[PDB]
PDB file of C-alpha atoms in Angstrom:
ATOM      1  CA  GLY A   1     106.291-112.665  -7.088  1.00 46.87           C
ATOM      2  CA  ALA A   2     108.605-114.925  -5.113  1.00 41.84           C
ATOM      3  CA  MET A   3     107.604-117.893  -2.975  1.00 39.24           C
ATOM      4  CA  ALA A   4     109.629-117.726   0.226  1.00 38.37           C
ATOM      5  CA  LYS A   5     106.755-119.455   2.021  1.00 40.46           C
ATOM      6  CA  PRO A   6     105.548-116.833   4.562  1.00 40.56           C
ATOM      7  CA  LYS A   7     104.827-119.422   7.240  1.00 35.45           C
ATOM      8  CA  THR A   8     106.562-121.279  10.000  1.00 35.41           C
ATOM      9  CA  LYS A   9     109.557-123.365   8.975  1.00 32.89           C
ATOM     10  CA  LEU A  10     111.964-125.715  10.730  1.00 31.61           C
ATOM     11  CA  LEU A  11     115.737-125.387  11.030  1.00 29.38           C
ATOM     12  CA  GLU A  12     118.356-127.267  13.055  1.00 30.08           C
ATOM     13  CA  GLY A  13     117.082-128.786  16.278  1.00 28.41           C
ATOM     14  CA  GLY A  14     113.654-127.266  16.588  1.00 25.51           C
ATOM     15  CA  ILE A  15     114.303-123.685  15.538  1.00 23.75           C
ATOM     16  CA  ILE A  16     111.222-122.150  13.942  1.00 21.37           C
ATOM     17  CA  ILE A  17     111.383-119.119  11.683  1.00 21.80           C
ATOM     18  CA  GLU A  18     108.391-116.973  10.812  1.00 24.53           C
ATOM     19  CA  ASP A  19     109.054-114.616   7.909  1.00 23.21           C
ATOM     20  CA  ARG A  20     107.155-111.454   8.767  1.00 24.91           C
ATOM     21  CA  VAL A  21     108.382-109.166   6.014  1.00 28.19           C
ATOM     22  CA  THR A  22     109.268-110.257   2.491  1.00 26.95           C
ATOM     23  CA  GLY A  23     112.992-109.627   2.308  1.00 26.45           C
ATOM     24  CA  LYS A  24     115.011-110.200  -0.821  1.00 23.06           C
ATOM     25  CA  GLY A  25     118.579-109.032  -0.721  1.00 22.57           C
ATOM     26  CA  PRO A  26     122.094-110.035   0.349  1.00 19.52           C
ATOM     27  CA  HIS A  27     122.162-113.364   2.182  1.00 19.95           C
ATOM     28  CA  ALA A  28     123.950-113.630   5.520  1.00 21.54           C
ATOM     29  CA  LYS A  29     126.625-116.311   5.677  1.00 20.89           C
ATOM     30  CA  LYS A  30     129.491-116.906   8.087  1.00 18.31           C
ATOM     31  CA  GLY A  31     132.106-114.161   8.006  1.00 17.84           C
ATOM     32  CA  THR A  32     129.406-111.756   6.877  1.00 17.05           C
ATOM     33  CA  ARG A  33     128.877-108.572   8.872  1.00 15.66           C
ATOM     34  CA  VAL A  34     125.165-108.094   9.336  1.00 16.05           C
ATOM     35  CA  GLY A  35     123.460-105.135  10.934  1.00 16.03           C
ATOM     36  CA  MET A  36     120.062-105.724  12.451  1.00 17.86           C
ATOM     37  CA  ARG A  37     117.481-104.582  14.961  1.00 19.62           C
ATOM     38  CA  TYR A  38     115.639-106.930  17.287  1.00 17.68           C
ATOM     39  CA  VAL A  39     113.393-107.483  20.273  1.00 19.17           C
ATOM     40  CA  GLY A  40     114.222-110.348  22.598  1.00 17.23           C
ATOM     41  CA  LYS A  41     111.201-111.892  24.275  1.00 11.88           C
ATOM     42  CA  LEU A  42     110.632-114.993  26.368  1.00 13.26           C
ATOM     43  CA  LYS A  43     107.992-117.627  25.604  1.00  8.75           C
ATOM     44  CA  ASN A  44     105.741-115.869  28.144  1.00 11.77           C
ATOM     45  CA  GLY A  45     106.087-112.562  26.311  1.00 12.07           C
ATOM     46  CA  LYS A  46     108.607-111.143  28.763  1.00 11.32           C
ATOM     47  CA  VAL A  47     110.865-108.778  26.852  1.00 11.43           C
ATOM     48  CA  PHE A  48     114.389-108.795  28.267  1.00 14.25           C
ATOM     49  CA  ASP A  49     116.341-107.366  25.331  1.00 17.73           C
ATOM     50  CA  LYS A  50     115.434-104.822  22.660  1.00 15.62           C
ATOM     51  CA  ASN A  51     116.867-102.461  20.082  1.00 15.59           C
ATOM     52  CA  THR A  52     114.630-100.658  17.626  1.00 17.17           C
ATOM     53  CA  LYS A  53     114.909 -96.893  17.960  1.00 17.05           C
ATOM     54  CA  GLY A  54     117.911 -95.885  15.858  1.00 18.97           C
ATOM     55  CA  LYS A  55     119.924 -98.708  17.415  1.00 19.34           C
ATOM     56  CA  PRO A  56     121.639-100.971  14.854  1.00 18.87           C
ATOM     57  CA  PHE A  57     123.334-104.104  16.156  1.00 20.61           C
ATOM     58  CA  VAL A  58     126.112-105.276  13.858  1.00 20.78           C
ATOM     59  CA  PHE A  59     127.657-108.712  14.213  1.00 20.60           C
ATOM     60  CA  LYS A  60     129.250-111.290  11.937  1.00 18.60           C
ATOM     61  CA  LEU A  61     128.246-114.934  11.706  1.00 18.14           C
ATOM     62  CA  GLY A  62     130.840-117.474  12.777  1.00 16.70           C
ATOM     63  CA  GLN A  63     131.669-115.764  16.064  1.00 18.04           C
ATOM     64  CA  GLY A  64     131.445-117.599  19.368  1.00 20.68           C
ATOM     65  CA  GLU A  65     129.643-115.045  21.539  1.00 20.48           C
ATOM     66  CA  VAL A  66     126.247-115.586  19.964  1.00 20.96           C
ATOM     67  CA  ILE A  67     124.083-118.625  20.675  1.00 18.49           C
ATOM     68  CA  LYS A  68     124.015-121.286  17.954  1.00 19.22           C
ATOM     69  CA  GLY A  69     120.333-120.596  17.327  1.00 15.88           C
ATOM     70  CA  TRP A  70     121.526-117.222  16.043  1.00 13.64           C
ATOM     71  CA  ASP A  71     124.582-118.305  14.020  1.00 15.78           C
ATOM     72  CA  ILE A  72     122.323-120.912  12.379  1.00 17.24           C
ATOM     73  CA  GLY A  73     118.966-119.087  12.199  1.00 12.87           C
ATOM     74  CA  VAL A  74     120.601-115.914  10.874  1.00 12.71           C
ATOM     75  CA  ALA A  75     122.388-117.941   8.198  1.00 14.16           C
ATOM     76  CA  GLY A  76     120.509-117.121   5.015  1.00 13.95           C
ATOM     77  CA  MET A  77     118.979-113.916   6.353  1.00 14.09           C
ATOM     78  CA  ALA A  78     118.345-111.089   3.884  1.00 14.35           C
ATOM     79  CA  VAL A  79     118.579-107.317   4.296  1.00 11.44           C
ATOM     80  CA  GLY A  80     115.068-105.893   4.199  1.00 14.55           C
ATOM     81  CA  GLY A  81     113.370-108.941   5.642  1.00 12.55           C
ATOM     82  CA  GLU A  82     111.982-109.555   9.109  1.00 11.11           C
ATOM     83  CA  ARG A  83     111.436-112.908  10.777  1.00 11.78           C
ATOM     84  CA  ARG A  84     110.331-114.006  14.207  1.00 13.96           C
ATOM     85  CA  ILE A  85     112.725-116.701  15.355  1.00 13.21           C
ATOM     86  CA  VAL A  86     111.748-119.277  17.960  1.00 14.27           C
ATOM     87  CA  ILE A  87     114.845-120.658  19.644  1.00 14.89           C
ATOM     88  CA  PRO A  88     114.457-123.828  21.751  1.00 10.33           C
ATOM     89  CA  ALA A  89     116.638-124.327  24.835  1.00  9.28           C
ATOM     90  CA  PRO A  90     119.345-126.623  23.242  1.00  8.08           C
ATOM     91  CA  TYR A  91     120.382-123.875  20.817  1.00  4.66           C
ATOM     92  CA  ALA A  92     120.500-121.105  23.405  1.00  8.76           C
ATOM     93  CA  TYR A  93     121.395-121.432  27.096  1.00 10.27           C
ATOM     94  CA  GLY A  94     119.984-124.938  27.328  1.00 11.08           C
ATOM     95  CA  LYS A  95     120.295-126.043  30.936  1.00  8.47           C
ATOM     96  CA  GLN A  96     121.474-122.775  32.458  1.00  8.69           C
ATOM     97  CA  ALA A  97     118.936-121.167  34.773  1.00  8.22           C
ATOM     98  CA  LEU A  98     119.614-117.454  34.550  1.00  9.30           C
ATOM     99  CA  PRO A  99     117.627-114.863  36.559  1.00  7.48           C
ATOM    100  CA  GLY A 100     114.355-114.624  34.655  1.00  6.10           C
ATOM    101  CA  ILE A 101     115.561-117.159  32.086  1.00  6.04           C
ATOM    102  CA  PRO A 102     115.718-120.674  33.636  1.00  5.92           C
ATOM    103  CA  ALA A 103     116.776-123.967  32.028  1.00  3.83           C
ATOM    104  CA  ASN A 104     114.582-125.203  29.149  1.00  2.00           C
ATOM    105  CA  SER A 105     113.914-121.595  28.206  1.00  2.00           C
ATOM    106  CA  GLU A 106     112.281-120.927  24.848  1.00  2.00           C
ATOM    107  CA  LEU A 107     113.481-117.602  23.467  1.00  2.00           C
ATOM    108  CA  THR A 108     111.467-115.659  20.911  1.00  2.00           C
ATOM    109  CA  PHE A 109     113.449-113.182  18.828  1.00  2.00           C
ATOM    110  CA  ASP A 110     111.841-110.518  16.683  1.00  2.00           C
ATOM    111  CA  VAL A 111     114.648-109.865  14.212  1.00  2.00           C
ATOM    112  CA  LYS A 112     115.025-108.042  10.926  1.00  2.00           C
ATOM    113  CA  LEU A 113     118.102-107.447   8.842  1.00  2.00           C
ATOM    114  CA  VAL A 114     118.653-103.820   7.908  1.00  2.00           C
ATOM    115  CA  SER A 115     122.300-103.815   6.840  1.00  2.00           C
ATOM    116  CA  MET A 116     125.188-105.992   5.661  1.00  2.00           C
ATOM    117  CA  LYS A 117     128.813-105.157   4.868  1.00  2.00           C
TER     118      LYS A 117
END
């Protein structure tokens, strides 16, 4: 019985986090090596990135090759928990119009933490 508030919550900027699975474990801070699995969708439901089937992605917070929505939204993540993260444009690519992902793009990330070292 722990109240982590399984609803939508607001982080820096306008980042929304929806805690899908009740996860209580090691918290992810900067310098921490977290291993996760995720599905990267656009606001329209267009999936551009994905790793689920036996594919662990391991990265540490504090690095500069992940968008700030990640380094911030992942901060305080727990192994065993899943959360759908809504990342507004300012904390991702912002004003860069990529093929398929134009400026003012709202990314939706289905992410769950499954490891930490």
